[PDB]
Amino acid sequence: EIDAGYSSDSSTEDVNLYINYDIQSEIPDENFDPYPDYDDFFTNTVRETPLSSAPEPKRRFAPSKHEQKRILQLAYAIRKGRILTSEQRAER
Amino acid sequence: APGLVVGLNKGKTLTKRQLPERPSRRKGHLSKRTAFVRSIVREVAGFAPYERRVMELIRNSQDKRARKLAKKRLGTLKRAKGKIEELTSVIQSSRLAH
Amino acid sequence: INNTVALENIYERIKYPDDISFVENQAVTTKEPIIIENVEDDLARELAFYKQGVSSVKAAFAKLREANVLISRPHDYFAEMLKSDDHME
Amino acid sequence: LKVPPAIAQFQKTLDKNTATQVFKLLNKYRPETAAEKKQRLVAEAEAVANGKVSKKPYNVKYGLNHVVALIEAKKAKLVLIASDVDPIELVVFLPALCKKMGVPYAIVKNKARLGTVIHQKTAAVLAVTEVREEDKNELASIVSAVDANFSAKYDESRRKWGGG
Amino acid sequence: SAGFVPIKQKVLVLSSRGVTYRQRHLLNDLVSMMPHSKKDSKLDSKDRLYQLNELAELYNCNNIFFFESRRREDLYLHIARAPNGPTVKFHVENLHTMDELNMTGNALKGSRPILSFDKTFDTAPHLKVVKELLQQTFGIPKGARRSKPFIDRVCTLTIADGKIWFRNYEIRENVTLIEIGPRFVMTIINILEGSFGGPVIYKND
Amino acid sequence: YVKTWFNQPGRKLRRRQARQTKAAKIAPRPVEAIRPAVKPPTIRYNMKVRAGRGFTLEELKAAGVSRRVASTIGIPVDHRRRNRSEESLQRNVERIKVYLAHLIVFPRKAGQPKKG
Amino acid sequence: ANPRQRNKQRSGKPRLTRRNANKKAKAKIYGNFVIQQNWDKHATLRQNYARLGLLATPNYVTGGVEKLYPDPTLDDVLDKEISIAPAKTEVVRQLEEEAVKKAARQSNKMLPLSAFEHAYIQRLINKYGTEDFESMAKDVKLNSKLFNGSKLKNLYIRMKA
Amino acid sequence: GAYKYLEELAKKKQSDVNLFLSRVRAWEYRQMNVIHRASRPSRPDKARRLGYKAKQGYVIYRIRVRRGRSARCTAEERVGRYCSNLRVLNSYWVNQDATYKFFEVILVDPSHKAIRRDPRINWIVNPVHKHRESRGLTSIGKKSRGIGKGHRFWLRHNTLSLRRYR
RNA sequence: AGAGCAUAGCUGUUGGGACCCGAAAGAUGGUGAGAACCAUCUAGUAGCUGGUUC
RNA sequence: AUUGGAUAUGCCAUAUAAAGCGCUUUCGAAGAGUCGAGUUGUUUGCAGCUCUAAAUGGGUGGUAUCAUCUAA
RNA sequence: UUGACCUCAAAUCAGGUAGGACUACGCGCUGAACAAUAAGCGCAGGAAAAGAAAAUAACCAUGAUUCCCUCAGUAACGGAGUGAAGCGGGAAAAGCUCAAAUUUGAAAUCUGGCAACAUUUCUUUUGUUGUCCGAGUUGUAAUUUCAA
């Protein structure tokens, strides 16, 4: 049950001259702390495990593949005579 | 022969089928990393002035005051109930430490 | 469906006190059956309902007078009116 | 105004001595320049063209998404954050994330020095994940110095509202 | 504390997403004639009716009014008593708000009316329940804030062909009742035993 | 404002020429794609069988056509529709299989590098 | 009537006449050569497709067709196999014969190993046997590219052919 | 990634960090011109998710519009008029105060060769995208004119269609 | 123990400028210097006036 | 004389590459002054103003729990 | 003192782009009298807009958009009047791109200058290759878009 009470803070309020029968100010609130100290409620403890459970790909244990793509492209240009070799650059 | 008979009737014999779940319906599922990121951001960023009011109300009992304030600012009661549970957990985690 | 026993228990549980004054309850249950067969006919239905309302109003006014409670609204008193004056005008 | 603790922590940076030692180890692990990478690749290209096994490269780690990923995976041993990132929100969470993962971290002065290490104009953050076996002691000494000069020091002003 | 100057009755007014011009006007008009009715925002979930009790408990209203709208055309009215209590569903038809011109009544706002109930309400136990519930809710209890001790209106509930007709009248000195303006038909749908929950105990059929 | 229909014969001819212009571009293959057979979504028409938009991914998988090659051979794909009953699955798998039985797919040239 | 159209009428300059008005004209066929050779430039596209033994639509037709002369169980659908369909006309037979003869000609789908691929797989075979590929892939020194068992199996198969 | 942190931090629109930064930056932005070029987006997560790429041909412009039509739509048209050689791509809210609402617009140069050679932004070069913000073809413009899918969102009715055989 | 549906013509009737013509509205946008003048909405109108063809 | 798409046939082809379909003792990120709530107008939409979110969440429907969809 | 970075600048520096006109048909912001109309203002193209569901439905379910027929002068609103939509039948059919997860065993990305080589509706147009500088780690490529 709720007893159909009435809180003291409801938006509705009680109370020619209206005297025939019966039944603003700048008030502050309280001394409040506007700049509370930083509260570390989550990072006060260290998470010991990595955040990601995804498996480790094999690309991180093997020689780089996009470097290999460039190497094959550079080797092709050397074969086609488009890029001067290091020896050719040195002798020139 | 290829061709559609576009008239009526194909057979009233019916048998249901079991369908899986589409990946779109998985929306709203909480990720482990996302929940971690939100907890980090919630701590790094402070609290709104209205959130500080609700937190200080919750600490000094006054649960009806906090619920009424949260509903007034957020809107619906569902949003207000979620904020109280979130801010209550923030208080308890803080009170366990400081 | 239409559980008489359940309704009777609910009525008893949420029954208002019988000793409560009619002025406090502001409810009237005068014995005047307002039966209007011509439901579509507005004039016939209104007259049947007004007859019960007139009897109920008179009984409540007499009860209010016997209860030392002001029933008639004073003309000098100026309170907010629920009815829209602009709509009537 | 009053500076929030998350932003006020960027006013206290690593001191002169420890920062100098930090960049001394970092300068041994600078990434390969665009020119140096080109020479190494054409050298392998000449070997491939004529007739034809290496080791994993060691260098500092840069890039914000990359470094934050390394911290979350606990792969980073030391994270150095630029103290003057123009939109501060890019790094305002970084000290706390480094605290959650238990990664040693420091806030070094300006981003030009960090960018110079990586041959860029600007680096908001640098991370060290792997060092050679001969640099294990040097990295361990810096981690202790960073802890003693940045973490053991302060640790109370970073919770206080600075400015005003 | 638990409650300061606790008035005997209080009414909570709500609505669902999709109310129309007439439905909104009727809700505003009903609030106007209800001095101690706490109007509230829209209810987000059109299905979760368990939240009404928590809303009533929070606002200390023992009576709940819900204006549920479906298909943007039909309007339903749910009335219940916060603590457990019977939840009775109504259908609202023949809408005539204050925007019309036929009405010519004049009743003071907050004035305590006189509730007249037809004898047909005593024919069946379910009609007895709805009459008692309407009397407890519609009737303004003494001591209510903004209420007026004077009487300038009378509410009449005429049961016609199984449907309740609500008519608000004006008392004129000489009774010569004059319609206040709220006119609609209360068509009972079903009555429950709990606050927007529990098994249904009465089906109008 | 009156909408006249004096161009009704002209539009009939213009659409016919579009069909012939399309057939000139794609000589041996049909001017329309094969549509599935579906049931209209109401109690008034659910006994009728009409043409759908495209074949569901479960229909294509059963018939042996992957969703990446289905469009290349003129089989539309409807990612939205699903088979709630085994009858719709069987009605449209057979439609695909009959379509593939009558299909001549001309080969395409492929680049084969000389080395490995 | 418009001032622009009056302007060019008053001019002594000729109009930019173009003659592109010829209806009843049907688009000529490009693309398939066999279709173009057998196409009838007068008949409609439905009449030509039917004569050539092709299907102009795999679906229903949305009107009445022309009549020129007075004519005189899921298991057994997902698992049944239909053995193609007969070629009604000669044109379809040319299309079918051309398709199979081109597919046979362009049928070399076996890739021979290159110089690097040959050496890579040879070093792995001459050390870890021939039938054990899982151990071949788990080697880190010889298998530097970290190919899995399937790729090493394919390198073996391509080496054989 | 660090954009998950920035996207989550941007939701706490008036936390201690966000309120302080919004107050500080509003003071600075009011010192500069009404429409002024931004060296880099203040919200690199939000600009990134709205199509912006940190490459040549992509331009960020900040603008303030008085509060008290849509404000975002007004920001887009004024910035698009300011640099009329560029195409307005998208826009986003960055800040607001009691007097002004601040927005940043992402503009794309349709003559730069880094834009004309990118197939992912090649579409904006076509002349049908000249002044999209003036025809309501941006995200806020589409929302402002009720363009959408569903029941939530005349000439053909006012006509009298008269067929040949009727 | 169904009598309808479609088309055409005729007649009546209701709308469209609606048999023709006859009083100034008003509004929008301009020109010239309060007032004046111009162009469109606009076939906004005459309970009536006059006329309405072998 | 210009050019379309193809066909056929040479010459090159940087394939240590890149794809579709099997399988899973491994993972699966999803758009915020936005949704929404209140109040004023225009016409449910749109906009201003005050406030301001969520993660199996959110939108929209049938229930009066289920269905459907996955916005900024 | 010098250098790196940032910021503010300047330049008859080099290379580009905007304006104005026409608007029958687009799309916007507006807006009277009597119509969401005229007029006013802004912005396009050969079409525009819309568009691959935060869509319907309650079925044996449908499946981006647009248009036509029908639904239907119906439901609904409000008696008059205003007046749709789902389904159904046709025309045409085509699907996709990102943001958000580390390439991290290698910024794999791009503009510009210069120098050659081609190429042209074209000595007028387009590129390619090489080199240097710049952009870019406050994120350019590949990969992924929930249908996964």
Coordinates of N, CA, C and O (backbone and C1' of nucleotides) in Angstrom, one line a residue, chain K residues 71-139:
Chain K
rC71 P -11.0 0.1 -57.4 O5' -10.4 -0.2 -56.0 C5' -10.4 -1.5 -55.5 C4' -9.5 -1.6 -54.3 C3' -9.7 -0.8 -53.1 O3' -10.6 -1.3 -52.2 C1' -7.4 -0.6 -53.8
rA72 P -11.8 -0.4 -51.6 O5' -12.2 0.6 -52.8 C5' -13.4 1.3 -52.7 C4' -13.2 2.7 -53.3 C3' -12.8 2.8 -54.8 O3' -13.4 3.9 -55.4 C1' -11.2 3.9 -53.5
rG73 P -14.8 3.9 -56.1 O5' -15.2 5.4 -56.4 C5' -16.0 6.2 -55.4 C4' -15.2 6.4 -54.2 C3' -15.9 7.2 -53.1 O3' -15.5 6.8 -51.8 C1' -13.9 8.3 -53.7
rU74 P -16.4 7.0 -50.5 O5' -16.1 5.8 -49.6 C5' -16.3 4.5 -49.9 C4' -15.3 3.5 -49.4 C3' -14.8 3.9 -48.0 O3' -15.7 3.4 -46.9 C1' -13.0 3.3 -49.4
rA75 P -16.0 4.4 -45.7 O5' -14.7 4.1 -44.7 C5' -14.5 2.8 -44.1 C4' -13.1 2.7 -43.6 C3' -12.7 3.7 -42.5 O3' -13.2 3.2 -41.2 C1' -11.0 3.6 -44.2
rA76 P -13.8 4.3 -40.2 O5' -12.7 5.4 -40.0 C5' -11.5 5.2 -39.3 C4' -10.5 6.3 -39.5 C3' -11.1 7.7 -39.1 O3' -11.0 7.9 -37.7 C1' -10.1 7.8 -41.2
rC77 P -12.1 8.7 -36.9 O5' -11.8 10.2 -37.3 C5' -10.5 10.8 -36.9 C4' -10.3 12.0 -37.8 C3' -11.2 13.2 -37.6 O3' -10.9 14.0 -36.4 C1' -10.8 12.8 -39.9
rG78 P -12.1 14.3 -35.4 O5' -13.0 15.3 -36.2 C5' -12.5 16.6 -36.7 C4' -13.4 17.1 -37.9 C3' -14.8 17.3 -37.5 O3' -15.0 18.6 -36.9 C1' -14.7 16.0 -39.5
rG79 P -21.7 12.3 -39.1 O5' -21.8 12.4 -40.7 C5' -23.1 12.2 -41.4 C4' -23.6 13.5 -42.0 C3' -22.8 14.0 -43.2 O3' -23.2 13.4 -44.4 C1' -23.1 15.8 -41.6
rA80 P -22.0 13.1 -45.5 O5' -21.7 14.5 -46.1 C5' -22.7 15.2 -46.9 C4' -22.3 16.7 -46.9 C3' -21.1 17.1 -47.7 O3' -21.3 17.2 -49.1 C1' -21.1 18.1 -45.6
rG81 P -20.1 16.9 -50.1 O5' -19.1 18.2 -49.9 C5' -17.8 18.1 -50.4 C4' -16.8 18.6 -49.4 C3' -15.4 18.0 -49.5 O3' -14.6 18.6 -50.5 C1' -16.2 18.0 -47.2
rU82 P -13.7 17.7 -51.4 O5' -12.4 17.4 -50.5 C5' -11.6 18.5 -50.0 C4' -10.8 18.1 -48.9 C3' -9.9 16.9 -49.1 O3' -8.7 17.2 -49.7 C1' -11.0 16.6 -47.0
rG83 P -8.2 16.4 -51.1 O5' -8.0 14.9 -50.6 C5' -7.0 14.6 -49.6 C4' -7.2 13.3 -49.0 C3' -7.3 12.1 -49.9 O3' -6.0 11.7 -50.3 C1' -9.1 11.9 -48.5
rA84 P -5.6 11.6 -51.9 O5' -4.7 10.3 -52.0 C5' -5.1 9.1 -51.4 C4' -4.3 8.9 -50.1 C3' -3.5 7.6 -49.9 O3' -2.3 7.7 -50.5 C1' -4.8 8.0 -48.0
rA85 P -1.7 6.5 -51.5 O5' -1.4 5.4 -50.4 C5' -0.5 5.6 -49.3 C4' -0.6 4.5 -48.3 C3' -0.5 3.1 -48.8 O3' 0.9 2.7 -49.0 C1' -2.4 3.3 -47.4
rG86 P 1.2 1.6 -50.1 O5' 0.9 0.2 -49.4 C5' 1.5 0.0 -48.1 C4' 0.9 -1.3 -47.5 C3' 0.7 -2.5 -48.5 O3' 2.0 -3.1 -48.8 C1' -1.0 -2.4 -46.9
rC87 P 2.1 -3.7 -50.3 O5' 1.0 -4.8 -50.5 C5' 1.1 -6.0 -49.7 C4' -0.2 -6.7 -49.7 C3' -0.6 -7.3 -51.1 O3' 0.1 -8.5 -51.4 C1' -2.5 -6.2 -50.2
rG88 P 0.9 -8.6 -52.7 O5' -0.2 -8.6 -53.8 C5' -1.2 -9.6 -53.8 C4' -2.3 -9.2 -54.8 C3' -1.8 -9.0 -56.2 O3' -1.5 -10.1 -57.0 C1' -3.3 -7.3 -55.6
rG89 P -0.2 -10.1 -57.9 O5' -0.7 -9.3 -59.2 C5' -1.8 -9.8 -60.0 C4' -2.1 -8.8 -61.1 C3' -0.9 -8.4 -61.9 O3' -0.6 -9.3 -62.9 C1' -2.1 -6.4 -61.3
rG90 P 0.8 -9.4 -63.5 O5' 1.2 -7.9 -63.9 C5' 2.1 -7.6 -65.0 C4' 1.8 -6.2 -65.5 C3' 3.0 -5.4 -65.9 O3' 3.5 -5.7 -67.2 C1' 1.6 -4.1 -64.5
rA91 P 5.1 -6.2 -67.3 O5' 5.8 -4.8 -67.6 C5' 5.2 -3.8 -68.4 C4' 6.0 -2.5 -68.3 C3' 7.5 -2.6 -68.0 O3' 8.2 -2.8 -69.2 C1' 6.5 -1.1 -66.5
rA92 P 9.4 -3.9 -69.2 O5' 10.5 -3.2 -68.3 C5' 11.0 -1.9 -68.6 C4' 11.8 -1.4 -67.4 C3' 12.9 -2.3 -66.9 O3' 14.1 -2.2 -67.6 C1' 11.6 -1.5 -65.1
rA93 P 15.2 -3.3 -67.6 O5' 16.0 -3.0 -66.2 C5' 16.5 -4.1 -65.4 C4' 16.4 -3.8 -63.9 C3' 16.9 -4.9 -63.0 O3' 18.3 -4.8 -62.9 C1' 14.8 -4.2 -62.3
rA94 P 19.3 -6.0 -63.0 O5' 19.5 -6.6 -61.6 C5' 20.7 -6.8 -61.0 C4' 20.9 -6.0 -59.7 C3' 19.6 -5.4 -59.1 O3' 19.7 -5.3 -57.7 C1' 21.1 -3.7 -59.6
rG95 P 19.5 -6.6 -56.7 O5' 20.7 -6.4 -55.6 C5' 22.0 -6.8 -55.8 C4' 22.9 -5.8 -56.4 C3' 24.1 -5.4 -55.6 O3' 25.2 -6.4 -55.7 C1' 23.1 -3.4 -56.3
rC96 P 26.0 -6.9 -54.5 O5' 27.1 -5.7 -54.2 C5' 27.1 -4.9 -53.1 C4' 27.5 -3.5 -53.4 C3' 28.3 -2.8 -52.4 O3' 29.7 -3.1 -52.6 C1' 26.5 -1.4 -53.0
rU97 P 30.7 -3.2 -51.3 O5' 31.0 -1.7 -50.9 C5' 31.6 -0.8 -51.9 C4' 31.7 0.6 -51.4 C3' 32.3 0.7 -50.0 O3' 33.7 0.6 -50.0 C1' 30.5 2.1 -50.2
rC98 P 34.4 0.0 -48.7 O5' 33.9 0.9 -47.5 C5' 34.8 1.6 -46.6 C4' 34.2 2.9 -46.1 C3' 34.4 3.2 -44.7 O3' 35.7 3.7 -44.3 C1' 32.2 3.7 -45.3
rA99 P 36.4 3.3 -43.0 O5' 35.4 3.8 -41.8 C5' 35.4 5.2 -41.5 C4' 34.6 5.4 -40.2 C3' 34.9 4.5 -39.1 O3' 36.1 4.8 -38.4 C1' 32.6 4.7 -39.3
rA100 P 37.2 3.7 -38.0 O5' 36.5 2.9 -36.8 C5' 36.2 3.6 -35.6 C4' 35.1 2.9 -34.8 C3' 35.4 1.5 -34.4 O3' 36.1 1.5 -33.1 C1' 33.3 1.5 -35.5
rA101 P 37.5 0.7 -33.0 O5' 37.6 -0.1 -34.4 C5' 38.7 -0.9 -34.7 C4' 38.7 -2.2 -33.9 C3' 40.0 -3.0 -34.0 O3' 40.9 -2.5 -33.0 C1' 38.1 -4.4 -34.4
rU102 P 42.5 -2.9 -33.1 O5' 43.1 -1.8 -34.2 C5' 44.3 -1.1 -33.9 C4' 45.4 -1.4 -34.9 C3' 45.1 -2.5 -35.9 O3' 45.9 -2.3 -37.1 C1' 46.8 -3.2 -34.6
rU103 P 45.3 -2.5 -38.5 O5' 46.6 -3.1 -39.3 C5' 46.4 -4.2 -40.3 C4' 47.7 -4.6 -40.8 C3' 48.8 -4.8 -39.8 O3' 48.8 -6.1 -39.3 C1' 49.6 -3.5 -41.7
rU104 P 48.8 -6.3 -37.7 O5' 50.2 -5.7 -37.2 C5' 51.4 -6.3 -37.7 C4' 52.6 -5.5 -37.4 C3' 53.0 -5.4 -35.9 O3' 54.4 -5.2 -35.8 C1' 52.5 -3.2 -36.7
rG105 P 55.3 -6.4 -35.3 O5' 56.0 -6.9 -36.6 C5' 56.7 -6.1 -37.5 C4' 56.8 -6.6 -38.9 C3' 55.5 -7.2 -39.5 O3' 55.4 -6.9 -40.9 C1' 57.2 -8.8 -39.5
rA106 P 54.2 -6.0 -41.4 O5' 54.8 -4.6 -41.6 C5' 54.9 -3.7 -40.4 C4' 55.9 -2.6 -40.7 C3' 55.9 -2.0 -42.1 O3' 56.2 -0.6 -42.0 C1' 58.0 -2.9 -41.6
rA107 P 55.1 0.5 -42.0 O5' 54.6 0.7 -43.5 C5' 53.3 1.0 -43.8 C4' 53.2 2.0 -45.0 C3' 54.4 3.0 -45.0 O3' 54.6 3.4 -46.4 C1' 52.3 4.1 -44.7
rA108 P 55.2 2.5 -47.4 O5' 54.0 1.7 -48.1 C5' 54.1 0.9 -49.2 C4' 53.1 -0.2 -49.2 C3' 51.7 0.1 -49.7 O3' 51.6 0.2 -51.1 C1' 51.6 -1.3 -47.8
rU109 P 51.6 1.6 -51.9 O5' 50.5 2.4 -51.1 C5' 49.1 2.2 -51.3 C4' 48.2 3.4 -50.9 C3' 48.5 4.6 -51.7 O3' 47.9 4.6 -53.0 C1' 48.4 5.2 -49.5
rC110 P 48.7 5.3 -54.3 O5' 48.4 6.8 -54.2 C5' 47.1 7.3 -54.2 C4' 46.9 8.7 -53.6 C3' 47.7 9.8 -54.4 O3' 47.1 10.2 -55.5 C1' 48.1 10.0 -52.1
rU111 P 47.9 10.7 -56.8 O5' 48.1 12.3 -56.6 C5' 46.9 13.1 -56.5 C4' 47.2 14.4 -56.0 C3' 48.2 15.2 -56.8 O3' 47.7 15.8 -58.0 C1' 48.8 15.4 -54.5
rG112 P 48.6 15.9 -59.3 O5' 49.8 16.9 -58.9 C5' 49.5 18.3 -58.7 C4' 50.7 19.0 -58.1 C3' 51.9 19.0 -59.0 O3' 51.9 20.0 -60.0 C1' 52.5 18.4 -56.8
rG113 P 52.6 19.7 -61.4 O5' 54.1 20.0 -61.2 C5' 54.5 21.2 -60.6 C4' 56.0 21.2 -60.2 C3' 57.0 20.8 -61.3 O3' 57.3 21.9 -62.2 C1' 57.5 19.7 -59.3
rC114 P 57.4 21.6 -63.8 O5' 58.7 20.7 -63.9 C5' 60.0 21.3 -63.5 C4' 61.0 20.2 -63.3 C3' 61.2 19.3 -64.6 O3' 62.0 19.9 -65.6 C1' 61.1 17.9 -62.7
rA115 P 61.7 19.7 -67.1 O5' 62.2 18.2 -67.3 C5' 63.6 17.8 -67.0 C4' 63.8 16.3 -67.2 C3' 63.2 15.7 -68.5 O3' 64.0 16.0 -69.6 C1' 62.7 14.3 -66.6
rA116 P 63.4 15.7 -71.1 O5' 63.8 14.2 -71.4 C5' 63.0 13.4 -72.3 C4' 62.9 12.0 -71.8 C3' 61.9 11.1 -72.5 O3' 62.3 10.6 -73.7 C1' 61.7 10.9 -70.1
rC117 P 61.4 10.8 -75.0 O5' 60.4 9.6 -74.9 C5' 60.9 8.2 -74.7 C4' 59.7 7.4 -74.2 C3' 58.5 7.4 -75.0 O3' 58.5 6.6 -76.1 C1' 57.9 7.6 -72.7
rA118 P 57.9 7.1 -77.5 O5' 56.4 7.4 -77.2 C5' 55.4 6.7 -77.8 C4' 54.4 6.2 -76.7 C3' 52.9 6.5 -77.0 O3' 52.4 5.5 -77.9 C1' 53.4 7.1 -74.8
rU119 P 51.7 5.9 -79.2 O5' 50.2 6.4 -78.8 C5' 49.5 5.6 -77.9 C4' 48.5 6.4 -77.2 C3' 47.6 7.4 -78.0 O3' 46.5 6.7 -78.6 C1' 48.5 8.5 -76.1
rU120 P 46.0 7.3 -80.0 O5' 45.0 8.5 -79.6 C5' 44.1 8.3 -78.6 C4' 43.5 9.7 -78.2 C3' 42.7 10.4 -79.3 O3' 41.6 11.1 -78.6 C1' 44.5 11.7 -78.6
rU121 P 40.2 10.4 -78.2 O5' 39.2 11.0 -79.3 C5' 39.0 10.4 -80.6 C4' 38.7 11.4 -81.6 C3' 39.7 12.5 -81.7 O3' 39.9 12.9 -83.1 C1' 37.5 13.4 -81.4
rC122 P 41.4 12.9 -83.7 O5' 42.1 14.2 -83.0 C5' 41.9 15.5 -83.6 C4' 42.6 16.5 -82.8 C3' 44.0 16.2 -82.3 O3' 44.8 17.4 -82.4 C1' 42.6 16.8 -80.4
rU123 P 45.7 17.6 -83.7 O5' 47.2 17.7 -83.2 C5' 47.8 16.8 -82.4 C4' 48.8 17.4 -81.5 C3' 48.3 18.5 -80.6 O3' 48.9 18.5 -79.4 C1' 50.1 19.3 -81.9
rU124 P 48.1 17.9 -78.1 O5' 47.0 19.0 -77.9 C5' 47.3 20.2 -77.3 C4' 46.0 21.0 -76.9 C3' 44.8 20.1 -76.4 O3' 44.1 20.8 -75.4 C1' 44.2 21.4 -78.3
rU125 P 44.4 20.4 -73.9 O5' 43.7 19.0 -73.7 C5' 42.4 18.7 -74.2 C4' 42.1 17.3 -74.3 C3' 42.5 16.4 -73.1 O3' 41.6 16.6 -72.0 C1' 43.1 15.3 -75.0
rU126 P 42.0 16.2 -70.5 O5' 41.9 14.6 -70.5 C5' 42.7 13.9 -69.6 C4' 43.0 12.5 -70.1 C3' 44.0 11.7 -69.3 O3' 43.4 11.0 -68.2 C1' 44.7 11.6 -71.6
rG127 P 43.8 11.5 -66.7 O5' 44.6 10.3 -66.1 C5' 46.0 10.3 -66.2 C4' 46.4 9.1 -67.1 C3' 47.7 8.4 -66.6 O3' 47.4 7.4 -65.7 C1' 47.9 9.0 -68.9
rU128 P 48.4 7.2 -64.4 O5' 49.7 6.4 -65.1 C5' 49.5 5.1 -65.6 C4' 50.8 4.7 -66.4 C3' 52.1 4.7 -65.5 O3' 52.2 3.5 -64.7 C1' 52.4 5.8 -67.6
rU129 P 53.0 3.6 -63.3 O5' 54.5 3.8 -63.7 C5' 55.2 2.8 -64.4 C4' 56.6 3.3 -64.8 C3' 57.5 3.9 -63.8 O3' 58.1 2.9 -63.0 C1' 57.4 5.3 -65.7
rG130 P 58.5 3.3 -61.4 O5' 59.6 4.4 -61.5 C5' 60.9 4.0 -62.0 C4' 61.8 5.2 -62.1 C3' 62.0 6.1 -60.9 O3' 63.0 5.5 -60.0 C1' 61.6 7.5 -62.7
rU131 P 62.9 5.8 -58.4 O5' 63.3 7.4 -58.3 C5' 64.6 7.8 -58.5 C4' 64.7 9.3 -58.5 C3' 64.2 10.0 -57.3 O3' 65.2 10.0 -56.3 C1' 63.2 11.0 -59.2
rC132 P 64.8 10.1 -54.7 O5' 64.3 11.6 -54.5 C5' 65.3 12.6 -54.5 C4' 64.6 14.0 -54.5 C3' 63.6 14.3 -53.4 O3' 64.3 14.8 -52.2 C1' 62.6 14.8 -55.5
rC133 P 63.6 14.5 -50.8 O5' 62.4 15.5 -50.7 C5' 62.6 16.9 -50.6 C4' 61.3 17.7 -51.0 C3' 60.2 17.5 -50.0 O3' 60.3 18.2 -48.8 C1' 59.4 17.4 -52.2
rG134 P 59.6 17.7 -47.4 O5' 58.1 17.8 -47.7 C5' 57.5 19.1 -47.7 C4' 56.1 19.1 -48.4 C3' 55.0 18.3 -47.6 O3' 54.5 19.1 -46.5 C1' 54.9 17.6 -49.8
rA135 P 54.0 18.4 -45.2 O5' 52.6 17.6 -45.6 C5' 51.5 18.3 -46.1 C4' 50.4 17.4 -46.5 C3' 49.9 16.4 -45.4 O3' 49.0 17.0 -44.5 C1' 50.3 15.3 -47.5
rG136 P 49.2 16.8 -43.0 O5' 49.0 15.3 -42.7 C5' 47.8 14.7 -43.1 C4' 47.9 13.2 -43.1 C3' 48.6 12.6 -41.9 O3' 47.7 12.5 -40.8 C1' 49.6 11.7 -43.8
rU137 P 48.1 13.1 -39.4 O5' 48.1 11.9 -38.4 C5' 48.7 10.6 -38.8 C4' 48.8 9.6 -37.7 C3' 49.8 10.0 -36.6 O3' 49.3 9.5 -35.4 C1' 50.5 8.0 -37.7
rU138 P 49.2 10.4 -34.1 O5' 47.8 11.1 -34.3 C5' 46.6 10.4 -34.5 C4' 45.4 11.3 -34.7 C3' 45.3 11.9 -36.0 O3' 43.9 12.1 -36.3 C1' 45.4 13.6 -34.4
rG139 P 43.2 11.4 -37.6 O5' 44.4 10.6 -38.3 C5' 45.0 11.0 -39.6 C4' 45.2 9.8 -40.5 C3' 43.9 9.0 -40.8 O3' 43.9 8.5 -42.1 C1' 45.5 7.7 -39.7

